[PDB]
Specification:
- The structure is cut from a larger assembly and holds five copies of chain A.
- The first copy, chain A, is mainly beta and 131 residues long.
- The longest helix of chain A is centred in the middle third of the chain and has 4 residues.
- In chain A, strand 9 and strand 10 form a beta hairpin.
- Chain A has a four-stranded antiparallel beta sheet, with no helix packed on it. In chain A, strands 8-11-10-9 form a four-stranded mixed beta sheet, with no helix packed on it. Chain A has a three-stranded antiparallel beta sheet with strand order 1-2-3, with no helix packed on it.
- The first copy, chain A, is 3% helix and 31% strand.
- Chains in contact: A-B, B-C, B-D, B-E, C-D, C-E, D-E.
- The interface between A and B is large, with 35 and 45 residues.
- Chain C: It comes from Severe acute respiratory syndrome coronavirus 2.
- Chain C: This is Spike protein S2'.
- It is classed as viral protein.
């Protein structure tokens, strides 16, 4: 709710979070559209020339704007990544454990950058006993 | 005069160390210009301080990832706890992770996680992107669980090579050997030792969920980082000399041929604030790196071994250390041997039996006033003086403080034939 | 505007700590830092440091009087070592400078 | 071939470790402006430095 | 000038804190016990 003489609202740093339009008396809001950087995940150029672009802290909505090829990590939307059920060691860290690691499985349905939750190592169970 | 303890209180003290500041980055163009093209062009002319800033902060984030990955991931294989837990009466259920919770953590780490609690989107608008740590809380908990399993089953040998299952009492007796106490003490007072350990663990658990000031270092580092970011944001609300503190007003009111001076003032002031901020971040990250190296070393020769260095693995003699996860930090449960229940005694460095001094081969010489006994240094275990506990070192004249007393020969009764 | 706030631990209290550590180190040996202070004859504690470097205890007692002169003469050398050249306190002066 | 010592020696070696520097504080307006109220207004314009 | 002085202090304060933390270790290992770390508590075999 705004007072009769209140139409501009500075949030913490003279940034107008909320404004009131002049014609009617609605109370509006301001939020920057698509702030947030990018990233590039690729193997060596000699090894391959296909890259995967990361859009951090961005929900998977702007992918068709700049472009399976869809993934929503805890850090941000990642394109050009093929999820895999199993887990290997971390080759190219991204975030939240998702470590991209390009691998050519059998030259068929491969030669693509894949992203997966990294394994922590080889699981083990020591044959413990009391004697 | 000598004093020897007769009882030991196995304390459990917690040492909390920062391990990593919150990963953070900022965009020069977003912070200084706020998505304005004129300011971006002016700063591109002004120089590559943008690249320097971004590279420095990216290096900070990378080295923090390295700290997190190096202080914890010291195990080649992720061991898991055994199903049946007959750990010599040591109730480990409080620190061993259990599947009852939706998150596979233990209880003490849960209390630590819920102890520390911290708007961000408003600051995030001006390029204050916060990257998430590569290792997640679940994987950190799994690392802690693997370390605890290794310590509880193999002890120290899993640091060197393959883990070797050891009965828990056996490795505890080995640790008493390492701290100069014979195995017999433990193998005679095992039940009392287990009761003391469980009582200490319970008291620690109750103490943790009493006052939130225990995690002082972690709370202070989080608060310092939040305050630094907050004042960095608040710096945007200053004129720095020009008519207005917002770029859009300057652009609208004044043409660039005249507004260039004011926008240059804003650019210089904000970049000065930003470089001050990154210098502070560099120094704080160096401090955190030193703390993380100390934490890694402490884990290396406390959890995976038994350091004979005083106060490195808790006050008093050191037995084990149980690492536990924490929000952007680690905590160690230094299981410390501490003597108590002392008693005055009369001591003599040597005994002259047949003209020859009989030094003790291992232990001290004490007397209850009537008899004469030899005991281990750190525990009152009276023993009859025999030739097995002593060794002759020549004539008994040069030594000072020697007392005339007999030495029982074990062979003589066997010579009854 | 420049000011020099005094340290909380004044020169008197600091010298008490070093005295307290010295008192603990001499009589109680080293156990005073770990658990509780335990009276130890200073001859025994020295003989129990030789045992910590492989030298048997008998060596110290067989040569205790010789050791006492060796250590005390070294201390006297230290006193002359300090008040001969001020360059011994290098790092401490550099901080002040 | 092995060399074994016969008569030992005991030395005393001094070691030097700094523990603290001179605690120092400073005030801007007294340093920067020097009790002048004309400069005190200008300084606060530069934000919370 | 103050920024340079303050920045100088923080970096220098890290030097002392590094030494002070090292001093505490020397005050703990060498003093409160006998340390087997060669060339950490004085050259040669250490006593106290």
């Amino acid at each position: 709710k705004f007072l009769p003489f209140q139409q501009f609202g500075r949030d913490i740093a003279d940034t107008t979070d909320a404004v009131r339009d002049p014609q009617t008396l609605e109370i509006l809001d301001i939020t920057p559209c698509s702030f947030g950087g990018v990233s590039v995940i690729t193997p060596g150029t000699n090894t391959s020339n296909q890259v995967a672009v990361l859009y951090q802290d961005v929900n998977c909505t702007e992918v068709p704007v700049a472009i399976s090829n869809v993934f929503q990590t805890r850090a941000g939307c990642l394109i050009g990544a093929e999820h895999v059920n199993n887990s290997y060691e971390c080759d190219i860290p991204i975030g939240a454990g998702i470590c991209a690691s390009y691998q050519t499985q059998t030259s068929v349905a491969s030669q693509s950058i894949i992203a997966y939750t990294m394994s922590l190592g080889a699981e083990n169970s020591v044959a413990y006993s009391n004697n | 005069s000598i004093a020897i303890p007769t009882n030991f209180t196995i304390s459990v003290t917690t040492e909390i160390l920062p391990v990593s500041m919150t990963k953070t980055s900022v965009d020069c163009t977003m912070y200084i210009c706020g998505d304005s093209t004129e300011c971006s062009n002016l700063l591109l002319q002004y120089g590559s301080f943008c690249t320097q800033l971004n590279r420095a902060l990216t290096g900070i984030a990378v080295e923090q990832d390295k700290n997190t990955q190096e202080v914890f991931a010291q195990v080649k294989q992720i061991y898991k706890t055994p199903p049946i837990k007959d750990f010599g009466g040591f109730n480990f259920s409080q620190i061993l992770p259990d599947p009852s919770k939706p998150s596979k953590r233990s209880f003490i780490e849960d209390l630590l996680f819920n102890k520390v609690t911290l708007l961000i989107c408003a600051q995030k608008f001006n390029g204050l992107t916060v990257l998430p740590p590569l290792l997640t809380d679940e994987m950190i908990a799994q690392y802690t669980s693997a370390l605890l399993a290794g310590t509880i089953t193999s002890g120290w040998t899993f640091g060197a090579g393959a883990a070797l299952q050891i009965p828990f009492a056996m490795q505890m007796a080995y640790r008493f050997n390492g701290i100069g106490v014979t195995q017999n003490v433990l193998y005679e007072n095992q039940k009392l030792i287990a009761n003391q350990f469980n009582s200490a663990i319970g008291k620690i658990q109750d103490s943790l969920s009493s006052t939130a000031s225990a995690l002082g270092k972690l709370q202070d580092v989080v608060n310092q980082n939040a305050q630094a970011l907050n004042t960095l944001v608040k710096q945007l609300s200053s004129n720095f000399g020009a008519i207005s503190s917002v770029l859009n007003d300057i652009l609208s009111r004044l043409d660039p041929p005249e507004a260039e001076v004011q926008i240059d003032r804003l650019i210089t002031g904000r970049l000065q604030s930003l470089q001050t901020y990154v210098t502070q971040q560099l120094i704080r990250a160096a401090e955190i790196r030193a703390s993380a190296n100390l934490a890694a070393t402490k884990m290396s020769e406390c959890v995976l071994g038994q350091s004979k260095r005083v106060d490195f693995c808790g006050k008093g003699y050191h037995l084990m250390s149980f690492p536990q996860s924490a929000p952007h930090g680690v905590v160690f449960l230094h299981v410390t041997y501490v003597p108590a229940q002392e008693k005055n005694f009369t001591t003599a460095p040597a005994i002259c039996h047949d003209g020859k001094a009989h030094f003790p081969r291992e232990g001290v010489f004490v007397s209850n006033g009537t008899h004469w006994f030899v005991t281990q240094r750190n525990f009152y275990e009276p023993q009859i003086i025999t030739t097995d506990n002593t060794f002759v070192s020549g004539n008994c004249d040069v030594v000072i403080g020697i007392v005339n007393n007999t030495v029982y020969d074990p062979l003589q009764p066997e010579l009854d034939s």
